[PDB]
Design a binder for this molecule. Structure first.
Ligand SMILES: [Mg+2]
Ligand SMILES: [Zn+2]
Ligand SMILES: [Zn+2]
Ligand SMILES: [Zn+2]
Lengths: 171, 93, 168, 519, 58, 107, 88, 229, 84
RNA sequence: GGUGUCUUGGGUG
């Protein structure tokens, strides 16, 4: 889910950069640094509200090094999953041991044991996909799936869902 | 650079020179503290870029501090006498 | 590096088991406190954005920053390009394509209408605006907490929601 | 910059919060339980795990790494273990306060003898300082000899009604005389009994006496698990090229471990009650003298050679202890010392520096587009000729020693690099004579390089230093950065100290021949 | 004076040290709020933006 | 004000504070023989009003605990009937500046 | 092994009288065996890092217990210069 | 509020002497022909006599001087001592002004009385030990510089300026500006470790040292004793 | 919250000795790290003397933040404090 | 590439 997040980022600037176009250079550095990153404490930082209008304030010179420190405060948007939250998706991969579904920026994997037993896999169909008497899961399908697990890995996180519960699955 | 030398540098108001005498011309060290519990019990693996305070089960709010090695030794001796010195990097009240 | 208003969280002698997340039980983590703060320290209600509000906010920010970049002079698959960096473009592209494949409110007007209509806990508030549900049953089972509050209104809210849902 | 990169943010210490360590947190921050006394495995390479030299505690060797953090000897801070005690014992530095709390509280139900009903105590509570509040509560609560069950119709305060003991101190043994109702049955109060009594004190009661709920619980003044410091705190030394003796703390911990195991050999089999006390008291004494070997009215924990053990308190106190001997003042690099001489031909703010000292000391000078030719000429000159240079520091911290580098001609200096050139003319240096009775005993001088091994001073500055030329020696300190150079030259320089604030008159004058001669 | 006893009293009462003094900042190896360290030096932007436009970060 | 001759017994002394809202002070006659505010070393004390104490605290951005202090048992505080929190202003001779105003708060 | 030069020792690990010696130079070579090739540690005695001079008299005998004993006397000359102390 | 290196012993001239000597040094009279300004020192000598809109200002000046006399004699220095360490030397400023503007030949001075009086008044209202428009700030500021204003008014009196120092307008303006600037330079800087400096200034003299005196008496004083020798 | 508006700044308008010393040191260290120099460098190559030249011409782009004992502070640019 | 710890006595400033 998307959360509106006030967040900051302390930075260090070399004296060589101490020019007349400083604030815009720090704005570009901030925009490069934060637009796309994941953090286990926040979720996923897709964009930043009012990117060009971040305030760098007044930086402080660190005694002994000569580099300036800035507390560039701004309000951004973050996307975080939670166990027990329902998230829609579209399947990406298929395999006998389960399938992958792309959710937002991420990819959600559902295990074989967590699938209605009327669903039967087919490696030979065009397109290859799960089928069922009155149920279908092919590439491009919609899946209203609940999250029952989210691992926090620092660089990339992965979520394994479960469509075994009522009111969930194909819609 | 004893205590009376420190008094003379304080009278002169030369704070940077005093800090440089006592740190970069002497036993300067680097330690990691837990931002939550404030003990120097943070296990740091710099080549693997991984940190942990196992008491607080913390891995994200950890800071490094440059302090005299004698100060680190003092805090470890205090911990050895069951005294907990907690180094906090921000004021509350 | 990445920090926020959450500061000390200093060590009381006791710990707390209630730190793991379970979104069925209104446990999100010690970053989404029931009363958030802003960059001026003032208190502020938590924010839980549905996909519609989020899509509008991101589109607005991107087009504003694009107009800023151009000196003063339409599709998510194009609108995500406004960022800087390949990783930025990729992540915003995936987010925008997900948003534009499930945005039942495909305008600011109906999103504003649902904002007016809804205003109550923002968690279920946003999950109702994000998850279409036929009757009371789906809501009270996907969100099991609407039972023990005795202020439901799911019937008419869902009716008016699916009524305002544009065709496709 | 001489620290390898870490990803954590750099911050400064703003607050220090003292307090006791709970057994829970002692176990939590620890990394290995210590129980086996014997240092080595069987005198075999890489000693017995679970001993006092477990490699989990950290590395003190140059070619071995810490099994806990994986860092070299230079970087590993050391890691704490824990060592559970068989019986709880008093902390030696808290016996008086344990005795005070014992007098204040009800020794059966853990409740204050008097309540907020009495307005005198109701106002003694109203002190903000924990220590003043504790004193104001002890000066009242110490005389009531019962836990009255009724609050001052019958209104009950929840009390019990058990009589109070007369607490007493004999060494490390807290005696408490219960005067029942005649014969006052006097019993010994063990650390475990006091611990049990202390765990029952309620949080608000605890707050009233002046303790803290999160940082200082009164039962943490009784030791039940003991932290084991890393070997850094108790490093070994070498006696004749192959021999090492452990530090005093290590042998003390070994003695404590022997005492602990002997305790664990009594509550596991027959123990007719006159050996348990003896061995538990041995444990108490070892733990006490591990922390404080200056206890009044008892012998001192002694070493093999007859000297007393260097306890931690003795490590911390005195002119030579940690605070005054290693933190308020310490030995410093980049300094020099030699006999001083007088030179009528020097300027007031000049000091003559011997060539050998000018070459031994150094200043690190960042290479810039205004000094690259001069610095490369110094690099060519080498570390044995003046003006030369001693080291070249690359943009990542790698030192290039110019002695052993045989190919000194094949170095091109990059920008942002650093050359550690020799001491040269007009460099500002701090000059100092002990004792430093006033701020004008340490003054900043401009350098002039001269032959001979003696310092040179203009003779008019010998009055503020109180110096003469019949044996005196003075110290020279070299600032290692541009900020400290500027501080010296703009605050401590000799011309700036001519007038003193002590008596708003000059302190430097015309002295000796220059005077007689001008007359 | 009385270093160990004072530290014990600080432990037994959970004293909070505000680190505003001189000696405390000395023993921790930090810049004392004294003399040259009694203020802060920021980086000025209003004066900086007067520089020639070719002196800019690239 | 209760001026006595020889002594005031502690049991009597205990009634002084429990008689609110009135205030009872006592002095001994031997103490009152000389007026100490006439001594050359005792400068003139002037109690501030509540508004003026607030003005003093805001001008210096001060809290009460950061002021110089005077004991409630001080002979000149005893002579002036100072209560806790009241601020005197003490103008006194200054050999470097002529005149100097000091402020003390009553313990 | 020490950072000084060992090229001045005779076959007995001792320098001979009459040889100029500078600071950090080894004047008595000694080895300490490594407890359980390359099974020895050194225990060599360098000259003091400050002093120059010329070896005068290398004595060699045995102690009370019959183990080898060595005394090496250096010699030098000090000529008065600036900073030397004199009194009447 | 002054830095302890910046002050020098100076005589306060309104304090000493008898009232007749004070009167002859300081009192001017316009109506009285003989006791007025000596005619041979000013260009405008003849225009001065008999005026009233100026004798009022002269009387105000003289009354301020008498107020200073009474204040210093009755409150600050009751025993008559008049040589005290004060900020900004006056003698050296006046002689430097004489040297710079070449004040010889006792030339007719073009420096009018009202300009002198208003110049000294403005100078006396420009010596800032504390800055702020608050009212306790003003009170503390005036108490801070009362003695120095007394000095500046004892020296820069109308009769003294015109007769004893014979300054013209340029030298006068220079004296005022120099007093301004050197007083602003005599102030202590924030950040001074005045406690360490004071401790050293008291302790260092102790290294060179039936009433008890010297080191035992200083020890009694600092270790506050309930009984003394 | 703790910043003081440019109108009610009641501290001294003069650069103190400690402020001057630290400002010169910081500027010299900055210039020695190949920072741009605002003055015209004619003869001198020492970063400290260049910093002194910049200080005299009121061309040092730094700010002094003067903390009061109550925690608040005032901001003064180097070009507006008066140098003797 | 790595040159150990504490006391006693005699001096220099
Ligand atoms: Mg001498
Ligand atoms: Zn922690
Ligand atoms: Zn380690
Ligand atoms: Zn009881």
């Amino acid at each position: 889910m998307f959360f509106l997040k006030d967040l900051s980022l302390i930075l260090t600037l070399h004296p060589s950069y101490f020019g007349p176009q400083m604030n815009q250079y720090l704005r570009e550095k901030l925009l490069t640094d934060v637009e796309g990153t994941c953090t286990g404490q926040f979720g996923y930082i897709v964009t930043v509200l009012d990117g060009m209008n971040i305030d760098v304030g007044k930086g402080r010179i660190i005694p002994g090094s000569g580099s300036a420190e800035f507390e560039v405060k701004y309000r951004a948007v973050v996307w975080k999953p939670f166990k027990g939250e329902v998230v829609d998706a579209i399947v990406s991969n298929v395999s006998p041991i389960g399938f992958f579904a792309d959710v937002g920026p991420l990819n959600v994997f559902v295990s074989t044991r967590l699938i209605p037993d009327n669903l039967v896999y087919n490696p030979s169909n065009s397109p290859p996909a799960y089928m069922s008497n009155d149920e279908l899961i092919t590439k491009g399908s919609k899946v209203r799936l609940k999250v029952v697990g989210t691992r926090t890995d620092v660089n990339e996180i992965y979520a394994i869902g479960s469509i075994k519960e009522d009111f969930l699955g194909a819609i | 650079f004893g205590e009376m030398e420190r008094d003379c540098m304080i009278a002169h108001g030369a704070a940077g020179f005093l800090k440089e005498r006592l740190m970069e011309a002497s036993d300067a060290f680097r330690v990691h503290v837990c931002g939550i519990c404030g003990l120097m019990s943070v296990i740091a693996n710099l080549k693997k870029n991984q940190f942990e305070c196992r008491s607080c089960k913390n891995k994200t709010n950890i800071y490094q501090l440059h302090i005299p090695y004698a100060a680190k030794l003092l805090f470890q001796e205090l911990m050895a006498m069951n005294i907990a010195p907690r180094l906090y990097t921000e004021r509350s009240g | 590096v990445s920090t926020s208003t959450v500061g000390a969280r200093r060590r009381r002698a006791k710990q707390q088991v209630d730190d793991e997340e379970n979104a069925t039980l209104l446990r999100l983590g010690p970053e989404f406190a029931l009363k958030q703060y802003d960059h001026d320290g003032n208190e502020h209600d938590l924010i839980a954005l549905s996909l519609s509000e989020s899509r509008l906010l991101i589109r607005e920010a991107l087009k504003a920053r694009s107009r800023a970049r151009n000196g003063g002079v339409i599709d998510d698959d194009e609108l995500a390009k406004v960022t800087s960096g390949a990783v930025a473009n990729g992540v915003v592209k995936k987010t925008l394509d997900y948003l534009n494949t499930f945005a039942r409110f495909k305008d600011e007007e109906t999103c504003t209408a649902v904002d007016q209509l809804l205003h109550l806990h923002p968690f279920e508030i946003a999950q109702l605006s994000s998850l279409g549900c036929e009757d009371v049953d789906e809501a009270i089972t996907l969100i099991p907490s609407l039972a023990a509050k005795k202020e439901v209104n799911l019937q008419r809210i869902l009716d008016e929601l699916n009524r305002l849902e544009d065709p496709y | 910059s001489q620290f390898p990169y870490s990803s954590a943010p750099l911050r400064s210490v703003k607050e220090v919060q003292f307090g006791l360590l709970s057994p829970e947190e002692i176990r939590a921050i620890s990394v290995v339980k210590i129980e086996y006394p014997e240092i080595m495995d069987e005198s075999r390479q890489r000693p017995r795990e679970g001993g006092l030299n477990d490699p989990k505690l950290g590395s003190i060797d140059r070619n071995f790494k810490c099994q806990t953090c994986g860092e070299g000897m230079a970087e590993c801070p050391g890691h704490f273990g824990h060592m559970e005690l068989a019986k709880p014992v008093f902390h030696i530095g808290f016996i008086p306060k344990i005795k005070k709390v014992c007098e204040c509280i009800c020794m059966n139900c853990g409740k204050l003898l008097l309540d907020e009903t009495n307005p005198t105590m109701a106002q003694a509570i109203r002190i903000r300082d924990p220590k003043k509040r504790f004193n104001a509560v002890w000066q009242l609560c110490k005389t009531k000899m019962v836990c009255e069950a009724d609050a001052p119709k019958v209104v009950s305060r929840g009390g019990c009604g058990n009589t109070q003991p007369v607490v007493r101190k004999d060494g490390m043994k807290l005696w408490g005389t219960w005067k029942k109702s005649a014969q006052p049955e006097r019993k010994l109060l063990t650390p475990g009994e006091i611990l049990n009594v202390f765990k029952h004190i309620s949080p608000e009661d605890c707050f009233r006496l002046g303790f803290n709920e999160d940082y200082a619980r009164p039962e943490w003044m009784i030791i039940t698990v003991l932290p084991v410091p890393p070997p850094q705190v108790r490093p070994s030394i070498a006696m004749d090229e192959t021999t090492q003796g452990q530090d005093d703390l290590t042998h003390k911990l070994s003695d404590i471990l022997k005492a602990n195991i002997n305790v664990q050999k009594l509550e596991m089999d027959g123990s007719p009650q006159h050996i348990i006390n003896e061995v538990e008291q041995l444990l108490q004494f070892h733990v006490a003298t591990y922390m404080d070997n200056d206890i009044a009215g008892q012998p001192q924990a002694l070493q093999k050679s007859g000297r007393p053990v260097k306890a931690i308190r003795a490590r911390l106190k005195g002119k030579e202890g940690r605070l005054r001997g290693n933190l308020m003042g310490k030995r410093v690099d980049f300094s020099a010392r030699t006999v001083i001489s007088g030179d009528p031909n020097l300027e007031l703010d000049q000091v003559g520096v011997p060539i050998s000292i000018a070459k031994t000391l150094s200043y690190p000078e960042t290479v810039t587009q205004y000094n690259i030719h001069r610095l490369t000429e110094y690099v060519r000159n080498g570390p044995n000729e003046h003006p030369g240079a001693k080291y070249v520091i690359r943009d990542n911290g790698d030192r290039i020693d110019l002695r052993y580098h045989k190919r000194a001609g094949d170095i091109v200096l990059q920008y942002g690099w650093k050359v550690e050139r020799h001491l040269m003319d007009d460099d500002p240096v701090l000059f100092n004579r002990q004792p430093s009775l006033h701020k004008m005993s340490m003054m900043a001088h401009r350098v002039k390089v001269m032959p001979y091994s003696t310092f040179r001073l203009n003779l008019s500055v010998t009055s503020p230093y109180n110096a003469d030329f019949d044996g005196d020696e003075m110290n020279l300190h070299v600032p290692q950065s541009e900020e400290t150079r500027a501080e010296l030259s703009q605050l401590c320089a000799v011309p700036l100290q001519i007038v003193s604030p002590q008596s708003n008159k000059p302190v430097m004058g015309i002295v000796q021949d220059t005077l007689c001669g001008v007359r | 004076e009385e270093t160990v006893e004072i530290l014990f009293e600080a432990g037994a009462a959970a004293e909070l040290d505000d680190c505003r003094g001189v000696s405390e900042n000395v023993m921790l190896g930090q810049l004392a709020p004294m003399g040259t360290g009694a203020f802060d030096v920021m980086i000025d932007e209003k004066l900086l933006t007067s520089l020639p436009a070719d002196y800019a970060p690239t | 004000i209760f001026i006595y001759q020889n002594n005031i017994t502690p049991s009597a002394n205990k009634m002084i504070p429990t008689v609110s809202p009135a205030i009872i002070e006592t002095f001994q006659e031997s103490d009152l023989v000389v007026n100490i505010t006439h001594h050359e070393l005792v400068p003139k004390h002037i109690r501030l009003s509540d508004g003026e104490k607030s003005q003093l605290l805001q001008r210096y951005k001060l809290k009460e605990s950061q002021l110089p202090r005077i004991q409630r048992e001080d002979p000149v505080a005893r002579y002036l009937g100072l209560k806790r929190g009241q601020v005197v202003k003490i103008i006194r001779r200054s050999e470097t500046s002529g005149r100097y105003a000091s402020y003390r708060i009553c313990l | 092994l020490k950072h000084g030069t060992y090229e001045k020792l005779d076959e007995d690990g001792l320098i001979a009288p009459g040889v100029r010696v500078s600071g950090d130079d080894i004047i008595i070579g000694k080895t300490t065996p490594i407890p359980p090739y390359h099974t020895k540690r050194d225990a060599s005695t360098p000259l003091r890092s400050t002093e120059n001079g010329i070896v005068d008299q290398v004595l060699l005998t045995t102690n009370q217990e019959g183990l080898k004993f060595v005394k090496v006397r250096m010699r030098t000359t000090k000529v008065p210069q600036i900073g030397d102390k004199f009194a009447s | 509020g002054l830095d302890g290196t910046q002050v020098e012993r100076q005589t306060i001239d309104t304090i000493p002497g008898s009232d007749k000597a004070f009167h002859k040094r300081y009192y001017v009279d316009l109506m009285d022909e003989k006791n007025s300004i000596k005619p041979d020192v000013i260009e405008y000598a003849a225009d001065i006599l008999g005026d009233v809109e100026l004798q009022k200002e002269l009387n105000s000046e003289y009354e301020q001087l008498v107020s200073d006399r009474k204040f210093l004699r009755e409150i600050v220095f009751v025993n008559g001592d008049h040589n005290w360490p004060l900020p900004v030397n006056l003698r050296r400023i006046i002689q430097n002004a004489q040297q710079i503007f070449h004040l010889d030949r006792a030339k007719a001075s073009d420096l009018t009385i009202p300009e002198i009086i208003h110049g000294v008044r403005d100078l006396c209202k420009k010596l800032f030990v504390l800055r702020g428009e608050n009212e306790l700030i003003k009170e503390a500021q005036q108490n801070a510089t009362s003695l120095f204003q007394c000095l500046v008014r004892a020296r820069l009196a109308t009769r003294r300026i015109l007769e004893e120092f014979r300054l013209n307008r340029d030298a006068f303006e220079w004296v005022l500006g120099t007093i301004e600037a050197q007083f602003q330079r005599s102030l202590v800087h924030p950040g001074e470790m005045v406690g360490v400096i004071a401790a050293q200034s008291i302790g260092e003299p102790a290294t060179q040292m039936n009433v008890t005196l010297g080191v035992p008496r200083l020890k009694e004083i600092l270790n506050v004793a309930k009984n003394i020798k | 919250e703790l910043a003081i508006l440019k109108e009610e700044r009641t501290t001294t308008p003069y650069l103190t000795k400690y402020e001057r010393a630290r400002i010169l040191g910081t500027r010299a260290l900055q210039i020695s790290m190949n920072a741009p120099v605002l003055v015209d460098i004619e003869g001198e190559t020492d970063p400290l003397q260049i910093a002194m030249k910049e200080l005299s011409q009121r061309k040092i782009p730094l700010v002094i933040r003067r903390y009061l004992p109550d925690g608040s502070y005032e901001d003064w640019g180097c070009d507006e404090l008066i140098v003797d």
